[PDB]
């Protein structure tokens, strides 16, 4: 993904303020609530039969943390997303059969959660740069389908 220095500074500055424990859990939790077919992939986490069960579930928070840590890694490797995410794409595509459209939904939910957390600071301009980033990450996760 190709960001101008202006875009990259903006993404990086905001990203340094992110609480990864908190944000990843809220993003993964909202994914499972808003798009309820996604709960099928996480059946082993226990009961996900309600918003309140999903958002209090410790495996969901711990997993959200792992997802966001992987996103952070993608952020300092933007010009090599494909190589960085190769094994991760293999796992999601070959072993888990996750349709690529679900990678886009999780990226957009993370953008919602950033807006929710940061308020005014998440300007339209900062948003626009993050959209480039989440699309880059979604693409990298899907490349093993190509």
């Amino acid at each position: 993904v190709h960001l101008s220095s202006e875009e990259k500074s903006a993404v990086t500055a905001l990203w340094g303020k992110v609480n990864v424990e908190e944000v990843g859990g809220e993003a993964l939790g909202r994914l499972l609530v808003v798009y309820p077919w996604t709960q099928r992939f996480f059946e082993s986490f226990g009961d996900l039969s309600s918003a309140n069960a999903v958002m209090n579930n410790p495996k969901v928070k711990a997993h959200g943390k792992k997802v966001l840590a992987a996103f952070s890694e993608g952020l300092s490797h933007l010009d090599n997303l494909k190589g960085t995410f190769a094994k991760l794409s293999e796992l999601h595509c070959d072993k888990l059969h996750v349709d690529p459209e679900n990678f886009r939904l999780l990226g957009n939910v993370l953008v919602i959660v950033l807006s929710h957390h940061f308020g005014k600071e998440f300007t339209p301009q900062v948003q626009a740069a993050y959209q480039k980033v989440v699309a880059g990450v979604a693409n990298a996760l899907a490349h093993k389908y190509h």
Partner: protein, 141 residues
């Protein structure tokens, strides 16, 4: 398809938006044009200058249209038939763009109403916008 619970979440959350609909409208549209540049192709006569009176006037009309829908949840195709003629017959908007605007509206509501935008209300609003989007991309008269 909306549940009885979804209908309540929508009506309740829309109450809290109060008189700022128009302003959220305009901001969601601006976030759309900036984050997804291919959408401007549908508005070749717009001035895209930040805070333009045109974008302001447009955001107003979108939020009026959503307020009207919230009032007619049991008959969206009924309430929105004129807007469907516009988007589906006349403009021929690719349904992909509706998902982008819907996303920008959610981003904007979460930005101004963090405490009302709980995971359950987010779920019901997403479904609301998807339902509205189907109607405006369908030719049914």
């Amino acid at each position: 398809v909306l549940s009885p619970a979804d209908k309540t979440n929508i009506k309740t959350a829309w109450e809290k938006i109060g008189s700022h609909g128009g302003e959220y409208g305009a901001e969601a549209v601006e976030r759309m044009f900036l984050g997804f540049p291919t959408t401007k192709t549908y508005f070749p006569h717009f001035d895209f200058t930040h805070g333009s009176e045109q974008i302001k006037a447009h955001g107003k009309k979108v939020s009026e249209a959503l307020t009207k829908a919230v009032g007619h949840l049991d008959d969206l195709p009924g309430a929105l038939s004129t807007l469907s003629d516009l988007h589906a017959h006349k403009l021929r908007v690719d349904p992909v763009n509706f998902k982008l605007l819907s996303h920008c509206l959610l981003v904007t509501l979460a930005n101004h109403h963090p405490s009302e935008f709980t995971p359950a209300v987010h779920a019901s609003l997403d479904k609301f916008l998807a339902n509205v989007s189907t109607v405006l991309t369908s030719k049914y008269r």
